[PDB]
Amino acid sequence: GSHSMRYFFTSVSRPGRGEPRFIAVGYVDDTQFVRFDSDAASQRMEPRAPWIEQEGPEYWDGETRKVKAHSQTHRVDLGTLRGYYNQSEAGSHTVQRMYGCDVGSDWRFLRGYHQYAYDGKDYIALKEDLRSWTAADMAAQTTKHKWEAAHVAEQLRAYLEGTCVEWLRRYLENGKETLQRTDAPKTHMTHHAVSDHEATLRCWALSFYPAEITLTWQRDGEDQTQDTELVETRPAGDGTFQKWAAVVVPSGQEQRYTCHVQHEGLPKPLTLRW
């Protein structure tokens, strides 16, 4: 199937409580592989998956150099945005950035991303064509005009279509045993009643990878959304994921309902009944 590489960056200013704190994390699909914490012991980019340890000192030096430079730029950006939005130096603020690339089943380029947020809302984003920008508000047009002049998109395009794709491929090959695995979900259904009148059926999906999954309820072979509850896919803590979907049914009608599970690790979709 398809794959992605993504980096996620967060900086928070806290006036009167020191200089900003910066956190960087890198993922391939749903697996974290690197981290940097500006207040942590090492002051280096750190490994978080076994296969990235295959990379040598030039890599760890280079990635450390780049992430530290990124942290300093966010410190500059926090000041820049305070100015753009005419804000005082008393409040706490947050800058976020994400970038990365998607490839299809043939490992060829599908899509690239490069975008920023300020205080929980969009600020600026690279469009799908990798040639133009979407500015979220009037303030962000200043950044847009600046980046168009300095040809930022062209440089970013080269990374997203080349370097990003090639290194995603390298990681997938180097960590084949884990990154290219598909762990099908362990599935079961439970039944619970507090009254004589209704019962909750809960369809479970456990120990699956990647996180991508679809859980649907049907009644008499028709999709059923009313009286259902679906929880957010959640991490087990061991590199696998969990999810449940539940439906409240009238007593005596449990057998009308089926739970349908779709996952890459399943050769065909699964059907569960009470």
Partner: peptide, 9 residues
């Protein structure tokens, strides 16, 4: 692998 340039708002 991270992008190899300095992008500033």
């Amino acid at each position: 692998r991270q992008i190899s340039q300095d992008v500033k708002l």
